[PDB]
Amino acid sequence: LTFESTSRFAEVDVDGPLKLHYHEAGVGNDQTVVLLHGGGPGAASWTNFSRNIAVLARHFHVLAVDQPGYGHSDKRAEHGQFNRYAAMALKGLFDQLGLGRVPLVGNALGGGTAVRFALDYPARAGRLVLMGPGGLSINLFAPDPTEGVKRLSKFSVAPTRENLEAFLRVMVYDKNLITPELVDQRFALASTPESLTATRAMGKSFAGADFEAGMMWREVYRLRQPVLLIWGREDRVNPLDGALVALKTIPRAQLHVFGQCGHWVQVEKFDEFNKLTIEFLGG
Numbered sequence: 001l002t003f004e005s006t007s008r009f010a011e012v013d014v015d016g017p018l019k020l021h022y023h024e025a026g027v028g029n030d031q032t033v034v035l036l037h038g039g040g041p042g043a044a045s046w047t048n049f050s051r052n053i054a055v056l057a058r059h060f061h062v063l064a065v066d067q068p069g070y071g072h073s074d075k076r077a078e079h080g081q082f083n084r085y086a087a088m089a090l091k092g093l094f095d096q097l098g099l100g101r102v103p104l105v106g107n108a109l110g111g112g113t114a115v116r117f118a119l120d121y122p123a124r125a126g127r128l129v130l131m132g133p134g135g136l137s138i139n140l141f142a143p144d145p146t147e148g149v150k151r152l153s154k155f156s157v158a159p160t161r162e163n164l165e166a167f168l169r170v171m172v173y174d175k176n177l178i179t180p181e182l183v184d185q186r187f188a189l190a191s192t193p194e195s196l197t198a199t200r201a202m203g204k205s206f207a208g209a210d211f212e213a214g215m216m217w218r219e220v221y222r223l224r225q226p227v228l229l230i231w232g233r234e235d236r237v238n239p240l241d242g243a244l245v246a247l248k249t250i251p252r253a254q255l256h257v258f259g260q261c262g263h264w265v266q267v268e269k270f271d272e273f274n275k276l277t278i279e280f281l282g283g
Ligand SMILES: O=C([O-])C(=O)/C=C/CC(=O)c1ccccc1
Pocket: 037, 038, 039, 040, 041, 043, 044, 048, 107, 108, 109, 110, 134, 149, 152, 171, 203, 237, 263
C-alpha cells in the first residue's frame, strides 16, 4: 500500500462543495472502519496512520479520511465548530459511499469528530475506538490550555521549525522519535499558507457561537455503543484525567492506559494499539 495507491477523493456538500481526500484499503474485507487523524500541524491520515493502516487493512475495509483543514481535503478559511463541521462532511461521505452503521477510530481532534458524528448521526456510528480524544475529554486536574495545546497555538502564531519541533516533542514519551527528518517533513507540510489558514480556523471554531458542540463530555452518556478509550499515561496534549467523565458516563465504555506512552499511542504502542483495536472491532 502506498499513499498513491490508496488515495481517493470525494466531493460532499457542507454548505456547498467540499472536497475530501481519503485513503482506502482492505477492499473486499467485510467490515468497514473509518479512521480519523489528529489535529496537529501537518497531520493527515497517511502521516498519522500509514503504518496502522497496513495492519488494519488485513482485517477491515479501511477508510482513513483527511479531515477538512488537513492533508489533501479542502482547507476553508471559515467554518462552524470544527467537530460538527467535520462530522457533517463525514455524513456526506457516508451517504455518497453508501455506508450504513460503521465503527470509527479517532485520535485527538479526530476522536472529537468521531464522537460528534456518533452523537449527531446516532444510527450511523458503530463501536468507537478513541485515542487521547478531544471533545469528550475534560481535564479535571490539568490546567487548560495544556502544554500540548499551548505548543500548537504557539506554532500557529509563529510557524518556525523550532516551534514545530517543540510541539512534536510533547506528542511522545520517547523523544528520540522526534528525528530531524520527522521535524523537517512535518514542517514542510505544516507551514504552507493553506495549512496555517486551516489551523487558525480550527482553534477559533471552538469558541464560536456553537461552542457547546465541542463540549461532548456533556452528551456522551447518550452513546449506546461500546466505546474503547485508549490513552497514553504520559499524554501531554489531552492528559489522562480527561478520560474520567467519558469512562463514568458512557454505559458501555472501556478504558486502556499504556504506561511509557505519550499522545501518539498509535505510534509508541503500535502493536498493542493495533491488537486492541482489531479485537474490539471484532476481527
Ligand atoms: O496529529 C497529530 O500530530 C496529533 O495527534 C495532535 C493532536 C492535537 C489535536 O488534535 C488538537 C486539536 C485542537 C486543539 C487541541 C488539540
